[PDB]
Design a protein around this ligand. Sequence first.
Ligand SMILES: CC(C)CCC[C@@H](C)[C@H]1CC[C@H]2[C@@H]3CC=C4C[C@@H](O)CC[C@]4(C)[C@H]3CC[C@]12C
Ligand SMILES: CCCCCCCC/C=C\CCCCCCCC(=O)OC[C@H](O)CO
Ligand SMILES: CCN(CC)C(=O)[C@@H]1C=C2c3cccc4[nH]cc(c34)C[C@H]2N(C)C1
Ligand SMILES: [Mg+2]
Length: 355
Amino acid sequence: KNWSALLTAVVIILTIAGNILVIMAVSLEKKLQNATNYFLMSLAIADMLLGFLVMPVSMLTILYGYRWPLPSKLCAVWIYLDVLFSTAKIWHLCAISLDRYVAIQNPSRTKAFLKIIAVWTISVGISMPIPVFGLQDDSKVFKEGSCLLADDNFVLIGSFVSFFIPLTIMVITYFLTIKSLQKEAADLEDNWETLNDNLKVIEKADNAAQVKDALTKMRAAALDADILVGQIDDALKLANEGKVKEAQAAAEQLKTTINAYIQKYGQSISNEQKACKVLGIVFFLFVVMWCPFFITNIMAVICKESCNEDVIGALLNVFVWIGYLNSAVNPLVYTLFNKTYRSAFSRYIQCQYKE
Ligand SMILES: CC(C)CCC[C@@H](C)[C@H]1CC[C@H]2[C@@H]3CC=C4C[C@@H](O)CC[C@]4(C)[C@H]3CC[C@]12C
Ligand SMILES: CCCCCCCC/C=C\CCCCCCCC(=O)OC[C@H](O)CO
Ligand SMILES: CCN(CC)C(=O)[C@@H]1C=C2c3cccc4[nH]cc(c34)C[C@H]2N(C)C1
Ligand SMILES: [Mg+2]
């Protein structure tokens, strides 16, 4: 007789319906057809699967006093499905943070799908010892008739390899991606004060030497952010030919072209930083919500005999559901911090599917 199962039934439904909306939005909405959102759909499938396969069986054990209700050889399957989905969710978030950083340092839907299949095939290979060595020995998967990973070596290896190692790569790549966009917003501010300064130099000039010098330093700055460079080179031969006046009215024609490319590359820097902040919330919530479970998991092993393992087991039964609540909160962030997901989720609820 448990009041917990009611509270846990809400978490299964918000998981399933929330993440169905995300899979529907990336499949259907043409504004969301980029590589990041393809990883977020794949993550949503894992969340939905966690709420279909893992979370209802977890609710069932609460209803049988943590005694394993199902057939014994279904224990290792439930432990494999949960760890498979949990390994995929962290290695996806690592693969997003990694893939976005490379993109800043670099200039397809198949390009993304190949990365996603790689992450899933890695997460199948990692989780493989759980049934291979646990369907053979129930000792590794049972503890006083309770289905939990009981093998301490699998817990330790599994905690770092499945959770801590990709977390570290993710928290490094997120920092370096923020530092990359602060450099690119900074480098674009610098070239503005090169271009804006030499447009003021050209309209003060008496002689062809001052315009040719200032057009030369405008072209150099033009090279860091093609139309502008050619337009500048066009005004240079005017200044080389000594046509100062002709050069001076040529360079205020550049001024309408400079604003057009400065505010385009500078809107798109601001869009990435807005997007980086939204993924950061997604990253922050996965670490914080799963941290109590994974730390307790380790202290259960470290103070094996020293600590009250009845209480430490009772803390895990709470903390595993804080992390299950994380499945429900990817799609709420998407509502609150993206107009494209919110508009999509609005139409899907009112049952309009046309874009
Ligand atoms: C909030 C995030 C970042 C971390 C939270 C971890 C907390 C909730 C966990 C991790 C380790 C846990 C402790 C591990 C060991 C023991 C000794 C045991 O005899 C009583 C409970 C007690 C004292 C636990 C209390 C809860 C605990 C402190
Ligand atoms: C060539 C060497 C072969 C030696 C075979 C000895 C068999 C010993 C028995 C059991 C486990 C041994 C292997 C454990 C490897 C774990 C690797 C892994 O990724 O596990 C993750 C964890 O299980 C969840 O996340
Ligand atoms: C309700 C009881 N269940 C369900 C099978 C658990 O104890 C799960 C055990 C896990 C676990 C142990 C040890 C190492 C690990 N790496 C990654 C995970 C992991 C996933 C982690 N899940 C989220 C809970
Ligand atoms: Mg200046």
